[PDB]
Amino acid sequence: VDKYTRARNAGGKRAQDCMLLAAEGDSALSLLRTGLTLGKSNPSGPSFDFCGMISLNKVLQGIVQVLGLDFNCHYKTQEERAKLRYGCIVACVDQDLDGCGKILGLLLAYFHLFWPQLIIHGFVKRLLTPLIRVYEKGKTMPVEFYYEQEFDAWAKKQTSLANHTVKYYKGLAAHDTHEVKSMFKHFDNMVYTFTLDDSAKELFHIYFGGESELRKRELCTGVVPLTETQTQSIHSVRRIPCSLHLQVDTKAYKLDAIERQIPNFLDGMTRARRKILAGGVKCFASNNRERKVFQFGGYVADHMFYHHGDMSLNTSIIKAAQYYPGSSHLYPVFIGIGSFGSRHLGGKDAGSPRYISVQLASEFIKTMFPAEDSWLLPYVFEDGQRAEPEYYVPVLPLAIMEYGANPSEGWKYTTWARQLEDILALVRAYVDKDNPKHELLHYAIKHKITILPLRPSNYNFKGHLKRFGQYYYSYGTYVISEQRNIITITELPLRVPTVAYIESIKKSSNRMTFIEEIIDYSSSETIEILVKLKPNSLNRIVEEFKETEEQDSIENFLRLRNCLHSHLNFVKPKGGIIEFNTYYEILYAWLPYRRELYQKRLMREHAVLKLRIIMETAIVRYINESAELNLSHYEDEKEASRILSEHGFPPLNHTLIISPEFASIEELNQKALQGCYTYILSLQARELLIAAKTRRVEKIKKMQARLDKVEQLLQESPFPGASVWLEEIDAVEKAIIKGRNTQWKFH
Amino acid sequence: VDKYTRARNAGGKRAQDCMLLAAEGDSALSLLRTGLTLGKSNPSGPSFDFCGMISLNKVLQGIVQVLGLDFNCHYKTQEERAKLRYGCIVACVDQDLDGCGKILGLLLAYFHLFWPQLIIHGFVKRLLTPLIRVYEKGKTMPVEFYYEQEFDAWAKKQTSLANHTVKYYKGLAAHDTHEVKSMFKHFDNMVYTFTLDDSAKELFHIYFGGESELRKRELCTGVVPLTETQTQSIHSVRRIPCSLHLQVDTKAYKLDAIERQIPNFLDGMTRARRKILAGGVKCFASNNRERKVFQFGGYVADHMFYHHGDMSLNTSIIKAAQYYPGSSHLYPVFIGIGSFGSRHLGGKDAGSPRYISVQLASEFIKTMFPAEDSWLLPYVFEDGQRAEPEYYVPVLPLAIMEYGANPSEGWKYTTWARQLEDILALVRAYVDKDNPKHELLHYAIKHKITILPLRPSNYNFKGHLKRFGQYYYSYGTYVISEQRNIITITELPLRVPTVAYIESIKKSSNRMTFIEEIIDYSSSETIEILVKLKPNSLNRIVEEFKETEEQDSIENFLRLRNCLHSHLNFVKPKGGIIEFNTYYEILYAWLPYRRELYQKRLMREHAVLKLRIIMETAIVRYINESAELNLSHYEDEKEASRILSEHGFPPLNHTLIISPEFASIEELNQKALQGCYTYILSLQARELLIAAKTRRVEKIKKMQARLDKVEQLLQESPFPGASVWLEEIDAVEKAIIKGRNTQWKFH
């Protein structure tokens, strides 16, 4: 066996007292070696006397060879279990879903499939290392939480976190030397035995069996965090049910694996694309100066917590800036300066990231993704730092607005962009109260039927879109020269690369028989392929390929027909996988999220306006009464605060009121009334004049007018923010038109 | 032929009028297609009528197949040349040294080797695209420079560059659409024919022949930029000699390729390591907070212009923070928090960059690499932006202070760290004027002989270092248990990974015969390997391996001896490759650079102190004379400046004097006397009081005292800055001792 360190007592008289520390990889093996050889100033801790190490079906073959397990044995009795070389096997995997969810899950499935009696009687354990450590100022011993729920509960009991620094250890390689010493000093109090319950068999069959339907049904919903009672019981008896592990960690790992290929139906982008968009918004906010692709990728990795390889990051950055006929992005996020790709190679002929540059399409991103609503979306947190939002909610349904296809395997995703005019008409009819077939559209939405039509986008396509049965076909255009006998292909079908199409024709002998030569003089955007045929071949070509209503004889000969198959599989905002049948369902699912976002924006604006009005009124009152109060004579802040409280001045938080970044409306109303009176003592000398008071009065008047406008907006029919939604739709349409006029180079 | 687009007239009556645009890759092919199909609003420009395209010995086989060249032909006559299908072949390669230096160089070598008459008579051309474009404000047409020397000469003639924006196009993929249109509008004025001269044959033989000695001799020196006369002649006759291209572009490409594996002898780090160190200094300057490896790599890529893959960046970041026995860095730049690697796998068992964190060893970096001297080193510029310095000059010879080895192939580099005490003694004896054997050391340096000894570092090595002949051998330590018959290896030789050593023993059958089992219970830092031998094997082992003075019988049996071979090949500061024989030569070469750096630091400090003294004296004079002058009554700045000039107030530059970042002493003395009188009108109201004047007088006194101290320092024997050098050496020694005491975790 390779990478196996046997214990001194393994396989001997005290073999049942031994342990086998199954390490995830090389880092886990290094940590285990450091802990086991630490037994110099550690009499109570473990050592190599009873603890062995191994690195994690050849690996499983080595595992069974070391443990001395028997395939034909059941280990239902103690005498049969005593033949094992080791008392128990302990898996040392990182707390991240990639390691504990996959490797430990596979090991548990293996053991359950072959030797379950070991699992029920107790043979498999796991190394539960502290997930989160909170260090105080002046206190050496930290507070350790094994789950994020426990840390959240503890932080709910903390008045302030200024004196506490929080460190997340999601991998075994994140533990420092003294932290490793601390964990291995209490090694016996940190191993957890796995147990089998009634639902464990069904969960194992679902997550590791050959039935894909059960797996898809189980993965339809999200991952539920462990209930505090379950966590408390686990910490109490030091036993972890297999069902809980399979339902939480394995499900999270599988959902994360799917989420890397399947986009959300609200914004149409995956996690990597959302990170790239957030990094682009943050990076180009100060100035829209051009930056190289690798520099922007480094910025995204540094700020947006993009821990994957830079190759995929650069590829996605290049794809987000591509703009050519048949490209994935009809409205790309970034303006690309340089050679970012051509339709002939399907965007695979892009320049090196060291040369091409990216810029933020501010006039489009600002309108499609409002900055005001960016403070209201739920954000994902990576090691306690605010990363990109969980999902973006654009003004228009960007999920169905662009060409989408999954190049990988394991999940089929393919969407064809719908027409901009049809989508705009549908959304405007839904939103506008004074619009034909508005009530009819709402009634149809309630009964889930379609009234207004949705058609595939015909932009950047000089072909023909036809409907046959329930399918949509795209036909390229060609012109034939009888005198020259050659055929000039002028337009390929939708999203058909030129080089791949030419090679596909060249790979067929039946078509190669009638074709003598193929030359590609197509421009960067316009296709022009000359196919020189053998003499006297038109009649033979017509006879070989009979003409039908579905397609022409030459169209069949040259394969100038493409089928628009759509696979509408998306990720729900609260986790899980959702399957749609038509784009109407996607639009109907996206609409309520945007309506709720508009309502939330209006409500938070109302709350912040009320707080600012209160602050300004208090400031004006203090300005008026400073002559009689004479607060400038006092020195201490406490005396001034007490006299202001006696006079009735309300206490407000300066920072939260003036900078309400990410505070929810209930949170904003909760913690804004426990501030101080700093806003009064911080007033400038020039601000005590009559002119400053008049300016503040004018500001109060304009803010009050905005408050009445917001209040009137909140009562708008059918839902609040309808006029704002229509205005933003008009702005987005204008930005899209301007981008299309200038080839998405806004100048 | 693949990726070949034939011209309409190629191989016909007008075949000699045709062209073959040899594209470097896919991006070049896309640019060529865009340019050639652009001929709609471009009657004068080229098109596919006479221009073909091809993608760049199978590729060369396709090239000769397309061109119809003959291997047995010489093409010495026009009639033989007329058989060619194309009139000429034009190479479209990016201006960067990777593309034009390698691919174009290989094509030129191919043509010279087989068909030189084509080269002399004129058959190979290159596409010379504008390297640098300067855009003015309000002027659409830019200024194009094909070489960096031309741009530098033009900028020397520019009074100000505020209205000019500079763009560098080092790749064919960096040209925008309108720029591509501009270049292809004047296509006939941008192709350059290659010519052969007398030295071309020798240069081709040197750079592409089988004689490695000639290549090494040629690469000993750096790359000389083309002289302005040569560039002017090239632009005049539109012909490029092959010798000039080989001497500049190919030499630069080869030197850059070598520089990625061979470190400088001044700081001991390559380009990537210098970029990482500069990024670490810049990133952790504000606060020394821990950052993840991938986040720091992204920061380095964004700011230090690291355009290579992130895998190598993360690997180098991890290596720079590793600290274990036998590691490459005896004094690592970064403190690593987490599991950064172990000696058992030779640092290959490091944790994932997503988990481990890095911090800047400020107490060591600040002392070893002074921040004051960081403004004086020559910096490399990447696309006009200031990247990491060309070379660092540490206080101590870091090139010989750490274990260095080149893991790649093509250049043999291996250095073994010398003892800290010996290096400190040598440098102190060189610097200190009152020191035994100081004059003797200087005399020996003049005669290039050694007096003080240099020995390999024995730190973190519980073995034996022995000297035999001119070689140094490292022996591990073992203990034998006769009763147990097993052998306990306690220390492996220097820089010998444990796993590799165990596998090497296991791979030999002769040693495997006497060994029954091998167990590795070694700690993270201490080696303890138990080798259980077969019964009655000590006598057989002794008989098989005879004992000699060089090594013991058991040492030969277990291969516990390592030879300390050193390959001292480095990169000179001004380019080229330098070969050393002993570490004394490296120290003697490094010393004058540090002495010159100290002298430059002292001189620039003197100049800036003089300028600041002049500024402060002028300010004090204005404060004294403001009562009579009454400058506050005036409104315009011009009138005040004129009256101050009449009164004799000197004009100084506020920004340059107060922030002399990277201004050389001659440059500082040149452009600091053409400023304005802003420093007088910008004075605060509170600064006109007597207390402010007294504070300024005290500041003037302290600055004058520092000026006299600097002046006395400049006259110090033997060279200026000797006491400063000794103080910095003492500080570096203290920092190294503190780091070694705390396992390079400064706390």
Residue numbers in the entry:
A (entry chain A), B (entry chain B): 415 to 470, 502 to 1192
The authors write:
The viral type II topoisomerase encoded by the African swine fever virus (ASFV) is critical for viral replication and infection, thus representing an attractive target for antiviral drug development. Type II topoisomerases can relax supercoiled DNA by a concerted strand-passage mechanism in which the enzyme first cleaves one DNA duplex (G-segment) and then guides the second DNA duplex (T-segment) to pass through the transient breaks. Similar to previously reported topo II structures of yeast and human, P1192R assembles into a large homodimer mediated by two interfaces.
Interestingly, 3D classification revealed two distinct classes with almost even particle populations, generating high-resolution reconstructions with C2 symmetry imposed at an overall resolution of 3.16 Å and 3.13 Å, respectively. One state has a closed conformation in the C-terminal dimer interface, and the other one appears open. In the open state structure, the interface of coiled-coil arms separates by ~17 Å, comparable with reported C-gate opening structures, thereby displaying an opening C-gate conformation. Compared with the yeast topo II, P1192R contains an additional pair of E817-R1046 salt bridge, which is retained in the closed state while disrupted in the open state. In addition, we found that the open state of the P1192R, yeast, and human topo II shared a similar opening distance (~17 Å) of the C-gate, while differing in the conformation of the coiled-coil arm. Since no DNA substrates are present in the cryo-EM samples, we consider that the C-gate could adopt both closed and open conformations prior to reaction, and its status might be self-regulated through inter-domain interactions. The N-terminal ATPase domain comprising amino acids 1–414 was invisible in both states, probably owing to its flexible connection with the other part of P1192R.
